[PDB]
Amino acid sequence: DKIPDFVVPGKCASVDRNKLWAEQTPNRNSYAGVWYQFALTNNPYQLIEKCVRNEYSFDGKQFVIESTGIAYDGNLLKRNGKLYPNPFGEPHLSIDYENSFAAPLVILETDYSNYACLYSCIDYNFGYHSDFSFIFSRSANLADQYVKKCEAAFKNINVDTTRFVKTVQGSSCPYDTQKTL
Amino acid sequence: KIPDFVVPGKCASVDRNKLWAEQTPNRNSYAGVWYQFALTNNPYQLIEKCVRNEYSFDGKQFVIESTGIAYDGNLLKRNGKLYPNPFGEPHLSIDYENSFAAPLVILETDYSNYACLYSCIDYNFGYHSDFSFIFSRSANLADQYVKKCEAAFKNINVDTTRFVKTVQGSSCPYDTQKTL
Numbered sequence: 001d002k003i004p005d006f007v008v009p010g011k012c013a014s015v016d017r018n019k020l021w022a023e024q025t026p027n028r029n030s031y032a033g034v035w036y037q038f039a040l041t042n043n044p045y046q047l048i049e050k051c052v053r054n055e056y057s058f059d060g061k062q063f064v065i066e067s068t069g070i071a072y073d074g075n076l077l078k079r080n081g082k083l084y085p086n087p088f089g090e091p092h093l094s095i096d097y098e099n100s101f102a103a104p105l106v107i108l109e110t111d112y113s114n115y116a117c118l119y120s121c122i123d124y125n126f127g128y129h130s131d132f133s134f135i136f137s138r139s140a141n142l143a144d145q146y147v148k149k150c151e152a153a154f155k156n157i158n159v160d161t162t163r164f165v166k167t168v169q170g171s172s173c174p175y176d177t178q179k180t181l
Numbered sequence: 182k183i184p185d186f187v188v189p190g191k192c193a194s195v196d197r198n199k200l201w202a203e204q205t206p207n208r209n210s211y212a213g214v215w216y217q218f219a220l221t222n223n224p225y226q227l228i229e230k231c232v233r234n235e236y237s238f239d240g241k242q243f244v245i246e247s248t249g250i251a252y253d254g255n256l257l258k259r260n261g262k263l264y265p266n267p268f269g270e271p272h273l274s275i276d277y278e279n280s281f282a283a284p285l286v287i288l289e290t291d292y293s294n295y296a297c298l299y300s301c302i303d304y305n306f307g308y309h310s311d312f313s314f315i316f317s318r319s320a321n322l323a324d325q326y327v328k329k330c331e332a333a334f335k336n337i338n339v340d341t342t343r344f345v346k347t348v349q350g351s352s353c354p355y356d357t358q359k360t361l
Binding site: 043044045046047049072080082084087088090094096098099100101102103104122123124125126 | 226227252262264270276279281282283284302303305306
């Protein structure tokens with residue numbers, strides 16, 4: 001039998017959230033601004049296929065997100081999101097979007113000015129989990145030195161980095177239009 | 182050949198504003214204990230049998246203590262919350278410790294006997310998954326109320342043959358569960 005490659009035997013990995021959480025709380029303003037999705041592992045929830053541009057505004061208690069790009073049907077699309085602390089006090093953020101589920105979102109590693117390596121995982125009741133990983137860049141491109149940092153981070157939590165797929169970005173993307181949606 | 186909870190098409194349009202208008206003044210009457218009578222295939226629900234959900238309303242949200250027997254046969258408690266959708270959408274979010282949060286619509290309830298609950302998520306490939314539940318104030322639920330939920334789910338084109346009954350009743354250690 002075959003199943004989606006994002007449904008994986010066993011439980012979600014450990015991932016040292018308290019340390020990350022404590023590193024990241026002082027730095028929220030530095031995480032704000034525009035992040036481009038450089039690559040992601042197979043994600044059946046992401047409605048934006050190409051030119052994925054995530055604009056974050058920090059209001060002192062959460063991030064308000066405008067996510068834009070080209071949808072799977074070829075039209076421009078804007079999605080309104082939020083990133084806020086997990087409501088049970090767990091050491092991670094919840095990422096939430098209009099007309100969507102909300103999920104944990106761990107920042108496995110970031111330097112704030114070039115890249116971010118993001119991770120979400122869910123355990124199922126039948127001995128499997130699904131996880132969803134992302135490489136974010138402050139630009140349309142991302143140098144291999146930074147990509148390799150994320151590769152290391154994901155390998156360290158036993159994520160198969162051959163699962164990453166690059167997202168269309170760059171001069172073919174109507175970013176100046178997207179930012180006005 | 183794909184799971185029976187991955188269904189073609191978009192999530193149904195459900196008439197959430199009418200339901201929110203009806204329900205928002207009655208939150209207090211939704212508190213207390215609800216047993217899960219039946220549900221459609223759900224890969225997220227960690228409690229297999231004897232599912233007992235105790236709701237406390239604080240004015241703004243519900244706190245939930247869910248107990249029963251896990252899939253390994255051991256007792257389990259899960260902590261949940263049910264709060265208004267943070268974007269101001271006319272539905273609640275159901276959230277549990279160390280899980281995802283999802284929309285949760287009350288398609289129909291009489292507060293004193295039954296509730297018919299519904300969640301749906303859209304995929305980027307044009308299918309959806311929905312997750313439906315029949316709750317009862319008791320371990321059993323009279324047929325008339327089962328039928329009311331069936332009609333409410335059929336009205337939004339959820340295939341009610343997907344429901345499976347949850348173990349409830351004498352085989353269940355509720356007084357231990359109350360305790361957890």
